[PDB]
Design a protein around this ligand. Structure first.
Ligand SMILES: [Mg+2]
Ligand SMILES: [Mg+2]
Lengths: 57, 1107
DNA sequence: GCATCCGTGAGTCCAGGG
DNA sequence: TATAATGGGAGCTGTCACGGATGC
């Protein structure tokens, strides 16, 4: 049952969520990269906030 | 030649300006011609007045705006992919309240797109049309509760995104609820907040029996307005602190803030008319002297109770009546996006008013510019302009959508919104609408219809006073129309007096037989019931509506031809369509022609001034059809005002010329016109009938790379001199060269990506001792199936009044023209909805032909008529036969046109011309004609005993002739309908549609073939194609479709190799998209395992993904 | 248990895209 | 790096059947 809670979140291989330069050198990328970056920023800020003993709120 | 016209209805008024719905709407929104101080508080002026002042201290206030001149004219905007637009300035002043200091400046806000003369826009080079939207009018409505048969819902509806929808209901427990933002609370509370006492509510509502009792709640009346207000703010904002000034602010912004709530002028007028009250402004309540004052709520409740009880003069509303649906035109749609951009700008202003130590410093225009751009490029009402032919553009500007932002979602639109309501009469065409899932949701304005200042569609009627028809015409909304008895336009008149005892009329749509005394108004014309396209179908009264719809719609798709003709049977609207769509140049005043060129006409007017008119020549439309103007005058000719100076596309001497008049036989022909296919004569190609000019645009960029620069050059590695033969010194193909698929239009080289050559390449280099070059060939080539003659090059290179997006050094564009002859697979159509693809082009000696040796041009199958019921095309053909021999054309107005007897008279005259010619030239009746007369006698078509000539004449008056088979010389065994028909060639050309692929590009993620001819794409073998293969048990065919032919990477490589070696294709393996599915499920925290029969994992990733 | 009041996912095929 | 500054804005509208969830 407890496996329905995540501890390690998996990360899809990068060719399934590419970052590609189209004709003209401009760049296109999957939305999943932004969803992951949000997750990673929030997690890293949580690890830091825990290190400084931030108030519970 | 001579034009004879039919019919007895004289139109009192001409059609109005047919694009005024675009032009006047936008002029109203911009008020660009109006001195600033005279402007009304409408359009962008009203946007400014809603945004400003911007307070909190500092204050930034609006004085006026100004529109300057466009930096670039229209042609230059099309050429350089610019937006045709005008700079917007605003005069603003910053006042500090305590200092009294006042700083004033004119700040630049960006650019606003300008409407061109014909009613369209030029957004980034491409012509666009803002399509008008239809929606439910704001106002106060009463509707049956679909659950409770004797109860009614009241609905207060403001302008879109200008307030919430409020509903009032009588609950089964008897209390009268109000719903806003999905919150069912008792209305008594809000009534208390407004300042109503139980005394006033008793005396104002008690008349309607027990209903008022469900409104009496003492726990509410026991509280002053402040305590009720705080109570409402709590049950509306759970968890929000019930602060007093915050509750005032919220309810004021919900019900009383004009900058947030707006019924609009239309919702104001209709709420006033419905509830029988007067409104101060356009909101449900006001804030006056520290308290809320009611405007609408009590009158609405009054009406709702009166309707529930049954008291007379209270009725439910028909929400599809065109008194309750209104048109949002371009001016209003744009003003709304302008208002959103201005709101974002004001938020930025308040932001910088907090953080800081000038009007310009406070104003960042970007959000505004972003919103306008977003409206004019990515909106669903902002549409790539259809200018296949000039009628296309005109029709596009008059379209009406029930979709778009703030409208309906298809797949959900029910039968009611798609219906033709009785009130559509004279307002919205009942035939012209799409055949797909959008049917009934996109429509066309009726020919005489006009959108009034509130947005309701009005139609014109003539006044009738005691049986006399006046020339007073009155434009009415459907609400006003419903008051009167209105006679039909074919009512017989002697002078101006109704010359009939019984008159067909309408009362509220209902047909009714009526005396002249009772007639109040009379239609202007049958024309007013239909769209412009539908008004171009002769004999419309003989065509079932379903096929009339197709003929309507397909006129839009007619290609402009190099020898276009106007129809031999016209309706009489062809000149006005050419005029209103700017498909021709006309004389501005009386004058004399001084100069005439392929390029320009110079005219000397009465004023003595010498006006020069440049002619647009072989220009490219949005659809690649050719826009060119051809002069139709000569030096020295005397012209009056309005006379034709030049024909545009699909114009013949100022008449709409959407196709050709061809000689047609109606008969089967050896299977080649089976199931709507069409047989034509090679003669048509020989004389360039149905030949059209098409222009394609190709574009290439040279950019800076991290690897070195792309160069547009002739020095392309490994190409012969034959491959470069027609490339100019700089590597651009020369004007006039013929280019075929594969040929280079623009030479370009790109530096190679850093690659260590495979050992096989190292060895092959050593064997030939040739240094691999450093750049590779990346030229622009003519794609498969295209080509023609190069007619223009444009060359924009940086460092030259030219600046491109960052990193591109030069852009080159090449224009290529083709002359397109009619070919097998091209689509032809007539105005009655007969449509077909050319299946066979016969040499002339195979064509059915008349006794005098004249072959016919096209052979249409009779099996296309009975179930289609579009007999107008048969009458057209009959009259065409007459016109053929009399050298004349006809105007036969819709529902007022040529009748069978007049067509028979004309056929008798034409017979005398067709047959007396023979009788003079020294010939009698042919033996084959006698055999066909024998058969005709048995068919009942000719009177037995008459002479050959008299029987031939009977046949001719039935529109039939003896016809010889060109292959045999023997006659067709019955006489055949033959005549002239107007047939168009549509913009569905097989040249553009044919496409094949062996291999080609694959998608990034799925590794499946790309879609699209331009991507050299593959065909979709979808779910249903798979079902078909499964149902045949074609297991290997299907497995190929799913693996070797799509995204089995090793499979596709190995199958290509095996075929080019002559071996058999190998066994497929796993498709890549299943690997993708497994990885995407692993990202969802699911372990998806392929097992073998012993339940042991099988690795489909061949170890490459296991540590 | 017995109704009502909710969320939610669904809607033929192709084409091109501005 | 030091005057003092202490709780946000946005909504948004013409579908429908159905499985599960809340009030009676
Ligand atoms: Mg369609
Ligand atoms: Mg469509």
């Amino acid at each position: 049952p407890e496996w329905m809670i995540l501890e390690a979140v998996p990360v899809l291989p990068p060719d399934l969520r590419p970052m590609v330069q189209v004709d003209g050198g401009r760049f296109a990328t999957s939305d999943l990269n932004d969803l992951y970056r949000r997750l990673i920023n929030r997690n890293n800020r949580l690890k830091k906030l825990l290190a400084q003993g931030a108030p519970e709120i | 030649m001579e034009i004879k016209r039919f019919g007895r209805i004289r139109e009192v008024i001409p059609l109005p300006p047919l694009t005024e719905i675009q032009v006047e709407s936008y002029r109203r929104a911009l008020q660009a011609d109006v001195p600033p101080e005279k402007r009304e508080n409408v359009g962008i002026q009203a946007a400014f007045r809603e945004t400003f002042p911007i307070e909190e201290g500092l204050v930034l206030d609006f004085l006026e705006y100004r529109l300057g001149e466009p930096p670039f004219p229209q042609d230059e905007c099309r050429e350089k992919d610019l937006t045709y637009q005008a700079p917007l300035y605003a005069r603003l002043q910053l006042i500090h309240k305590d200092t009294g200091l006042i700083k004033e400046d004119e700040v630049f806000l960006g650019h606003i797109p300008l409407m061109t003369e014909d009613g369209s826009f030029i957004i980034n080079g491409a012509d666009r049309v803002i399509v008008s939207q239809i929606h439910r009018s704001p106002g106060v409505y009463f509707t049956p509760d679909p659950a409770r048969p004797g109860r009614y819902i009241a609905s207060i509806i403001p302008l879109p995104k200008r307030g919430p929808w409020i509903d009032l209901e009588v609950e089964p427990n008897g209390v009268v609820s109000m719903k806003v933002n999905k919150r069912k609370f008792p209305l008594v509370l809000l009534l208390r907040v407004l300042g109503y006492d139980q005394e006033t509510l008793a005396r104002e509502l008690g008349a309607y029996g027990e209903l008022v009792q469900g409104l009496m709640d003492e726990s509410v009346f026991a509280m002053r307005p402040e305590e009720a207000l705080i109570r409402l703010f709590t049950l509306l904002r759970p968890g929000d602190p019930p602060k007093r000034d915050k509750a005032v602010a919220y309810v004021y912004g919900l019900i009383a803030d004009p900058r947030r709530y707006d019924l609009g002028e239309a919702g104001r007028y209709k709420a006033e008319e419905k509830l029988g009250i007067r409104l101060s402004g356009r909101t449900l309540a006001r804030f006056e002297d520290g308290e809320f004052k009611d405007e609408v709520f009590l009158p609405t409740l009054r009406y709702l109770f009166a309707l529930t009880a049954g008291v007379p003069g209270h009725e439910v509303d028909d929400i599809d009546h065109l008194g309750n649906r209104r048109i949002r035109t371009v001016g209003e749609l744009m003003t709304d996006q302008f208002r959103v951009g201005l709101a974002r700008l004001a938020r930025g202003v308040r932001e910088r008013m907090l953080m800081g130590s000038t009007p310009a410093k406070l104003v960042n225009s970007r959000p505004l510019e972003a919103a306008i751009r977003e409206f004019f490029s990515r909106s669903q009402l902002s549409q790539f302009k259809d200018e296949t032919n000039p009628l296309s553009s005109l029709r596009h500007k008059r379209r009406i959508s029930a979709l778009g932002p703030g409208g309906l979602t298809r797949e959900r639109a029910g039968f009611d919104v798609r219906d033709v309501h009785r009130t559509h009469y004279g307002r919205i065409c009942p035939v012209e609408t799409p055949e797909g899932a959008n049917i009934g949701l996109i429509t066309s304005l009726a020919a005489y219809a006009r959108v009034d200042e509130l947005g309701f569609i009005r139609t014109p009627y003539r006044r009738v006073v005691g049986g006399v028809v006046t020339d007073e015409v009155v434009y009415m909304t459907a609400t006003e129309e419903d008051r009167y008895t209105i006679a039909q336009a074919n009512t017989p008149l002697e002078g101006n007096r109704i010359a009939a005892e019984r008159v067909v009329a309408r009362r509220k749509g209902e047909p009714v037989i009526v005396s002249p005394e009772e007639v109040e108004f009379m239609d202007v014309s049958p024309k007013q019931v239909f769209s412009v396209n539908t008004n171009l179908i002769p004999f419309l009264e003989h065509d079932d509506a379903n096929r009339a719809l197709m003929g309507s719609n397909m006129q839009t798709q007619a290609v402009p031809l190099i020898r276009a003709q106007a129809p031999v049977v016209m309706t009489g609207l062809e000149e006005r369509v050419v005029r209103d769509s700017l498909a021709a140049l006309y004389a501005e005043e009386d004058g004399e022609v001084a100069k005439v060129d392929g390029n320009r006409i110079v005219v000397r007017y009465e004023d003595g001034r010498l006006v020069e008119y440049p002619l647009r020549r072989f220009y490219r439309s949005n659809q690649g059809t050719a826009l060119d103007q051809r002069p139709r005058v000569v030096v020295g000719q005397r012209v009056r005002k309005g006379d034709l100076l030049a024909d545009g596309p699909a114009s013949e001497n100022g008449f709409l010329a959407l196709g050709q008049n061809v000689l047609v036989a109606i008969m089967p022909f050896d299977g080649y016109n089976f199931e709507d296919a069409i047989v034509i004569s090679e003669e048509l190609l020989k004389r360039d009938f149905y030949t059209s000019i098409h222009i394609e645009r190709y574009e290439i960029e040279a950019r800076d790379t991290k690897l070195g620069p792309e160069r547009i050059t002739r020095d392309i590695p490994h190409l012969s001199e034959a491959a470069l033969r027609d490339l100019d010194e700089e590597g651009v193909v020369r004007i006039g060269a013929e280019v075929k698929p594969g040929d280079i239009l623009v030479g370009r080289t790109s530096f190679k990506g850093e690659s260590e050559p495979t050992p096989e390449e190292r060895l092959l280099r050593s064997i030939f001792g040739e240094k691999a070059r450093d750049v590779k060939d990346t030229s622009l080539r003519v794609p498969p199936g295209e080509g023609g003659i190069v007619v223009r090059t444009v060359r924009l290179r940086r460092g030259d009044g030219v600046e491109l997006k960052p990193g591109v050094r030069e852009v080159v564009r090449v224009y290529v023209a083709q002359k397109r002859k009619l070919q097998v697979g091209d689509k032809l159509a007539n105005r009655h909805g007969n449509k077909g693809v050319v299946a066979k082009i016969l040499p002339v000696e195979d064509m059915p032909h008349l006794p005098d040796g004249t072959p016919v041009d096209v052979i249409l199958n009779p099996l296309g008529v009975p179930s289609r019921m579009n007999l107008g095309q048969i009458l057209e053909t009959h009259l065409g036969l007459a016109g053929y021999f009399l050298g004349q054309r006809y105007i036969s107005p819709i529902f007022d046109g040529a009748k069978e007897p007049e067509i028979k008279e004309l056929l008798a005259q034409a017979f005398e011309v067709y047959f007396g010619k023979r009788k003079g030239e020294g010939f009698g009746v042919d033996k084959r004609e006698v055999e066909v007369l024998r058969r005709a006698e048995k068919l009942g078509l000719v009177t037995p005993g008459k002479t050959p000539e008299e029987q031939l004449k009977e046949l001719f008056l039935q529109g039939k002739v003896v016809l010889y088979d060109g292959r045999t010389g023997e006659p067709i065994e019955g006489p055949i309908v033959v005549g002239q028909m107007f047939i168009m060639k549509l913009y569905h050309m097989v040249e553009d549609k044919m496409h094949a692929r062996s291999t080609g590009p694959y998608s990034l993620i799925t590794q499946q073939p790309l879609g699209g001819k331009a991507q050299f794409g593959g065909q979709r073998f979808g779910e249903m194609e798979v079902w078909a293969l499964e149902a045949y048990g074609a297991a290997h065919t299907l497995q190929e479709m799913l693996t070797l032919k799509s995204d089995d990477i090793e499979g596709r490589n190995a199958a290509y190799e095996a075929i080019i070696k002559g071996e058999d294709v190998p066994e497929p393996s796993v498709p890549e998209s299943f690997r993708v599915l497994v990885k995407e499920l692993q990202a969802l925290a699911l372990d998806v395992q392929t097992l073998d029969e012993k339940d042991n994992p099988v690795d489909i990733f061949e170890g490459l993904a296991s540590k």
